Amino acid sequence: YQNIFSQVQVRGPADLGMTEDVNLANRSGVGPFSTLLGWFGNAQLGPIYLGSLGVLSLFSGLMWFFTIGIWFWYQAGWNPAVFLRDLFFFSLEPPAPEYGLSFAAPLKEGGLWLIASFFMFVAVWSWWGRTYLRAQALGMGKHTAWAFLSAIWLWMVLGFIRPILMGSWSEAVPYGIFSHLDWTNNFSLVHGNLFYNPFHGLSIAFLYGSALLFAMHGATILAVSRFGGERELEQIADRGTAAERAALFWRWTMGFNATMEGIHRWAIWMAVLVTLTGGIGILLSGTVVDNWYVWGQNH
Amino acid sequence: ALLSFERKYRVPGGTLVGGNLFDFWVGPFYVGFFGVATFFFAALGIILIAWSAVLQGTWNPQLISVYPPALEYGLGGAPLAKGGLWQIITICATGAFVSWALREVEICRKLGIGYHIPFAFAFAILAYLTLVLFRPVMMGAWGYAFPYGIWTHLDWVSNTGYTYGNFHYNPAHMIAISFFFTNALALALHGALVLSAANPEKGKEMRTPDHEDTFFRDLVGYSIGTLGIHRLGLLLSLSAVFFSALCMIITGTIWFDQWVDWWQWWVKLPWWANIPGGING
Amino acid sequence: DLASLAIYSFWIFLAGLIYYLQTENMREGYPLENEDGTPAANQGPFPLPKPKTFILPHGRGTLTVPGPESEDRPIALARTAVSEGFPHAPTGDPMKDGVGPASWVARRDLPELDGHGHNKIKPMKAAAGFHVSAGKNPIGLPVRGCDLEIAGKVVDIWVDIPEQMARFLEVELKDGSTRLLPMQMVKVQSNRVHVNALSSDLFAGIPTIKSPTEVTLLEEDKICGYVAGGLMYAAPKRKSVVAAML
Numbered sequence: 127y128q129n130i131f132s133q134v135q136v137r138g139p140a141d142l143g144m145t146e147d148v149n150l151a152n153r154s155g156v157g158p159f160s161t162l163l164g165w166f167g168n169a170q171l172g173p174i175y176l177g178s179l180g181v182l183s184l185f186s187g188l189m190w191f192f193t194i195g196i197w198f199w200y201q202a203g204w205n206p207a208v209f210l211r212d213l214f215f216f217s218l219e220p221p222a223p224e225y226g227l228s229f230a231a232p233l234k235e236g237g238l239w240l241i242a243s244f245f246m247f248v249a250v251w252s253w254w255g256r257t258y259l260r261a262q263a264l265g266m267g268k269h270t271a272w273a274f275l276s277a278i279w280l281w282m283v284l285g286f287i288r289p290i291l292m293g294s295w296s297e298a299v300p301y302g303i304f305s306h307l308d309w310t311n312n313f314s315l316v317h318g319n320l321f322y323n324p325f326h327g328l329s330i331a332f333l334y335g336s337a338l339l340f341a342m343h344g345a346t347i348l349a350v351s352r353f354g355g356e357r358e359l360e361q362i363a364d365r366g367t368a369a370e371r372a373a374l375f376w377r378w379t380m381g382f383n384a385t386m387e388g389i390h391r392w393a394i395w396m397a398v399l400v401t402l403t404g405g406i407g408i409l410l411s412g413t414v415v416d417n418w419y420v421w422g423q424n425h
Numbered sequence: 426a427l428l429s430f431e432r433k434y435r436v437p438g439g440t441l442v443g444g445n446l447f448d449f450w451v452g453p454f455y456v457g458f459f460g461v462a463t464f465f466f467a468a469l470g471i472i473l474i475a476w477s478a479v480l481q482g483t484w485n486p487q488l489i490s491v492y493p494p495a496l497e498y499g500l501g502g503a504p505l506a507k508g509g510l511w512q513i514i515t516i517c518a519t520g521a522f523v524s525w526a527l528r529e530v531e532i533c534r535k536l537g538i539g540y541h542i543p544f545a546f547a548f549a550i551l552a553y554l555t556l557v558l559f560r561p562v563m564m565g566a567w568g569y570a571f572p573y574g575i576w577t578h579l580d581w582v583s584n585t586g587y588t589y590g591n592f593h594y595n596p597a598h599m600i601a602i603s604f605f606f607t608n609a610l611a612l613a614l615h616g617a618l619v620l621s622a623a624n625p626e627k628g629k630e631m632r633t634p635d636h637e638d639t640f641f642r643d644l645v646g647y648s649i650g651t652l653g654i655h656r657l658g659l660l661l662s663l664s665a666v667f668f669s670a671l672c673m674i675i676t677g678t679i680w681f682d683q684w685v686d687w688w689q690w691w692v693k694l695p696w697w698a699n700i701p702g703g704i705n706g
Numbered sequence: 707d708l709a710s711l712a713i714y715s716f717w718i719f720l721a722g723l724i725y726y727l728q729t730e731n732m733r734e735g736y737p738l739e740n741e742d743g744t745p746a747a748n749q750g751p752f753p754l755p756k757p758k759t760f761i762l763p764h765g766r767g768t769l770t771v772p773g774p775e776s777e778d779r780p781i782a783l784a785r786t787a788v789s790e791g792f793p794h795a796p797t798g799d800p801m802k803d804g805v806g807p808a809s810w811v812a813r814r815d816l817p818e819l820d821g822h823g824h825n826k827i828k829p830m831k832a833a834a835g836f837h838v839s840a841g842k843n844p845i846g847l848p849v850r851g852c853d854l855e856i857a858g859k860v861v862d863i864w865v866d867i868p869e870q871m872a873r874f875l876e877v878e879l880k881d882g883s884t885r886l887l888p889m890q891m892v893k894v895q896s897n898r899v900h901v902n903a904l905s906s907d908l909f910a911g912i913p914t915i916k917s918p919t920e921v922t923l924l925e926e927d928k929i930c931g932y933v934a935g936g937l938m939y940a941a942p943k944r945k946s947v948v949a950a951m952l
């Protein structure tokens with residue numbers, strides 16, 4: 127038995143969750159129970175907290191998706207068959223260079239893109255506020271909100287900060303499945319190969335490293351789950367043989383190890399540094415460094 | 426030196442080979458038969474690389490590079506200076522990686538824990554082997570493998586990719602990337618949640634797992650659970666590597682042209698292939 | 707050059723972070739000791755971090771780390787060589803003494819509490835509303851050990867109430883008493899529950915719990931360590947795969 131999938135599922139009264147300082151009035155009712163999910167993790171869905179910040183976020187979120195969707199349907203001649211076969215090829219492009227950073231572009235030539243970006247901007251930041259508040263209501267630390275900022279950073283640099291510093295919305299990313307891939311490839315071409323951007327290489331080390339570390343941590347916990355290993359919070363407060371065997375596996379393997387609490391500090395930074403270094407690398411491209419190959423020759 | 430709770434665990438037994446011959450430690454490192462095997466392989470490999478550096482004429486870490494046999498050599502052997510050295514070093518690397526895994530297994534047995542870790546690591550090894558062994562062989566030549574050099578291997582990645590246009594269009598590659606991104610997302614989430622619960626607002630008591638399920642339930646309407654999150658992290662990581670190996674194994678063996686063209690099968694579907702309008706109409 | 711100044715500053719930062727992370731992961735297990743229990747000469751290049759204090763809910767006090775080692779019980783192991791780095795063999799029965807892969811830690815002899823202060827784990831028969839929702843129900847099945855003999859029968863499932871999951875199977879032995887078996891160490895089949903880590907004659911030896919309605923962290927550790935220890939120490943009584951294939 128490897129404990130990858132549960133052998134027997136057990137169920138009881140729906141769990142409504144801790145109260146603490148949260149406004150119980152904004153909490154929805156319990157959702158259905160999924161036996162399918164129950165084989166892998168919890169079977170219970172909901173309840174969810176739906177305050178004003180969340181409603182606003184969901185609203186802009188939908189408007190963003192709607193704005194893109196209406197442009198795609200327009201590109202499809204309002205033909206369902208065409209909409210589906212060309213779905214990955216449609217693209218909502220930003221204003222042309224001639225428009226700079228103005229909001230003058232006509233709807234079909236950058237205006238819809240600007241609207242789409244406004245809705246996305248509001249959706250993401252309102253959601254970020256939500257991650258902070260939900261932690262505050264339960265008296266928890268703000269580690270989730272902080273980590274989320276790192277991801278927000280790359281996004282901000284790509285569609286707002288860099289375009290603004292470059293002087294035009296045309297520098298931003300289009301909304302499209304294949305189009306945004308073309309944009310990514312072109313971005314490297316235009317800046318003399320990103321493999322030469324030092325921050326791009328670091329970002330890769332952390333992306334690889336996150337898969338490396340989570341495979342390591344996930345496998346470790348499962349390996350000591352026979353000693354209640356996943357109850358990490360209590361293992362932190364009162365170390366057990368699960369924590370000891372886990373630490374010793376690694377100390378005997380690579381000469382050093384972590385603690386039940388400390389491993390989660392290694393984890394959060396490993397992931398967070400992915401977009402932190404990534405954002406810096408992109409922000410420097412085109413504003414300070416035009417060609418990384420050339421740059422590399424002088425450093 | 427030992428950790429203050431270590432003694433009771435440094436017990437005999439667990440080895441897969443050599444009985445108690447290599448059953449001992451050196452500082453914090455456990456040895457075992459596979460401990461010495463790893464050392465052997467790693468040393469020989471590093472030595473052969475240093476020799477290849479000499480034949481190349483440099484000691485610069487940024488310049489040293491060992492290339493495999495040129496396409497002319499097919500799947501046969503080659504002169505130590507023209508692909509042969511890479512070939513031996515590849516054997517040593519494989520021997521060292523596998524030995525490292527098997528050493529991890531002995532350590533698992535001695536501690537009475539599961540074998541998940543070495544199992545996970547095997548996925549990494551299998552990814553390496555795909556680029557350096559399985560794909561080259563299926564393609565018919567060792568030349569298709571990548572060179573061992575800090576920057577030279579990046580050139581190989583670039584040239585290999587552009588041989589098929591923009592590699593982004595490789596469907597298996599897309600799935601692999603999704604797994605890498607989602608994994609990093611999950612890793613950040615797990616780290617932050619545990620820490621946010623163990624380190625609540627200054628002056629408050631340690632939160633419980635209940636607070637963790639509640640936080641995410643409040644946030645997205647679903648909580649995977651303390652056991653599931655670890656199960657997920659392992660799955661995403663391995664799936665990312667699994668699909669990496671798959672996206673490459675098929676390139677140059679069953680797919681030869683520009684990856685972007687592969688998507689025509691979807692656009693050319695009978696019921697909408699010829700309908701005018703749209704991007705492809 | 708801005709790019710150059712940036713990459714230069716990053717490495718300074720990274721080294722500082724690694725330094726921070728490493729010392730932070732030294733809240734437990736340090737200072738390092740010699741194989742005889744005395745402080746080791748080389749404590750490494752990383753100093754101990756300043757103490758932090760965890761405030762534990764429901765009158766469980768506090769926890770301050772780094773702090774003096776908690777472990778102090780007898781370890782039934784004897785040195786095997788004059789030189790450091792070698793195994794320490796069991797002076798008696800490792801399974802009963804709790805050493806090697808059968809080790810257990812002196813965790814608080816109280817049950818783990820949920821967010822309300824209620825016991826986290828409880829036998830299902832007493833867990834209002836809980837039931838097997840999917841998969842083969844283990845209750846009522848005979849339990850087989852690696853020697854391929856029946857060691858008892860399953861009489862209940864101990865569930866984690868807050869996380870709604872099965873944690874232990876309660877097995878009734880021949881003498882009428884019962885023991886708890888960790889879920890991740892059993893294999894529920896269609897006509898039985900197989901336990902590879904233990905031979906039938908070792909079940910009686912599984913550590914017991916004071917109360918029949920709750921289990922403490924101390925007891926869980928003794929139970930889990932003992933069962934795992936069987937993979938190594940019960941190897942002689944574990945019948946081959948082809949033998950079990952009948």
Ligand code: BCL
Nearest residue numbers: 277278280281310311313314326329330333404405407408
């Ligand atoms: C030909 C193409 C170029 C190239 C061009 C680029 C470009 C361009 C960029 C990268 C970037 C990256 N590249 Mg590169 N790259 C190349 C080759 C490689 C190779 C390789 C060959 O093996 C690898 C492994 C990588 C790897 C990487 C990653 C390390 C990095 C992306 C990090 C990330 O997590 O972003 C994913 C994370 C995000 C985008 C953050 C998202 C956060 C927001 C808030 C999400 C909100 C979503 C929400 C509103 C909508 C959906 C909601 C639903 C509920 C789901 N590149 C080649 C040379 N690469 C990025 C970087 O940082 O570069 C330094 C970047 O911009």
Ligand code: BCL
Nearest residue numbers: 326327328330331332334335338553571575576578579582
């Ligand atoms: C996976 C797809 C490609 C590939 C694509 C890329 C791309 C694209 C990039 C890298 C980058 C790196 N690659 Mg690579 N790389 C490949 C296969 C390998 C193999 C291998 C044995 O299979 C190795 C050891 C490396 C090693 C390296 C590192 C030098 C560097 C950062 C990786 C990292 O932090 O990972 C996460 C792992 C950790 C955080 C653990 C620590 C690992 C340490 C740092 C590895 C040191 C390697 C050492 C110098 C190699 C020789 C060791 C002995 C002398 C033999 N690559 C395959 C062929 N690699 C990045 C770079 O900066 O390149 C210069 C980068 O941009």
Ligand code: BCL
Nearest residue numbers: 549550552553582583585586591592593601602669670673
């Ligand atoms: C211009 C180039 C093309 C392109 C061409 C390629 C090519 C070509 C390849 C990839 C591959 C990959 N690409 Mg791509 N790719 C592009 C753009 C991207 C972008 C992006 C944001 O645009 C992303 C995110 C990616 C992402 C990915 C990954 C899914 C995958 C590499 C990881 C891997 O396989 O790990 C697997 C992990 C390993 C191989 C590591 C094994 C390590 C071993 C086991 C141990 C080593 C130990 C070490 C020696 C120890 C030293 C001692 C020290 C003490 C540590 N690509 C562009 C369009 N991509 C690669 C792939 O899929 O590989 C199968 C690949 O070959």
Ligand SMILES: CC[C@H]1c2cc3[nH]c4c(c3C)C(=O)[C@H](C(=O)OC)c4c3nc(cc4[nH]c(cc(n2)[C@@H]1C)c(C(C)=O)c4C)[C@@H](C)[C@@H]3CCC(=O)OC/C=C(\C)CCC[C@H](C)CCC[C@H](C)CCCC(C)C
Nearest residue numbers: 334337338341467470518525545546548549573574575666
């Ligand atoms: C499969 C999922 C992910 C994963 C998992 C993973 N890796 C693992 C484990 C796991 C679970 C371990 O248990 C093991 C470990 O101990 O980690 C601390 C390991 C490990 N992953 C490592 C690296 C690594 N993992 C990577 C990736 C991945 N690992 C995936 C993303 C990568 C990359 C590039 O993404 C790297 C670089 C090692 C740190 C460690 C294994 C240590 C080891 O094998 O040691 C024995 C060998 C030596 C000490 C040296 C041998 C050198 C050779 C003789 C020469 C080889 C030359 C080489 C082929 C070229 C190098 C030049 C490059 C510039 C190309």
Ligand SMILES: CCCCCCCCCCCC[N+](C)(C)[O-]
Nearest residue numbers: 281284285299300301302303306
């Ligand atoms: C069916 C609609 C699917 C369209 C969603 C497109 C997601 C790709 C987003 C890339 C945009 C990058 N960005 C935000 C920085 O501009």
Ligand SMILES: CCCCCCCCCCCC[N+](C)(C)[O-]
Nearest residue numbers: 335381382392395396723724728
């Ligand atoms: C923060 C992630 C950075 C990834 C590089 C990981 C380096 C591991 C260094 C180990 C240093 C600690 N030490 C000396 C005690 O072994």
Ligand SMILES: [Cl-]
Nearest residue numbers: 267269620624
């Ligand atoms: Cl903190």
Ligand SMILES: [Fe+2]
Nearest residue numbers: 347358615619
């Ligand atoms: Fe964890």
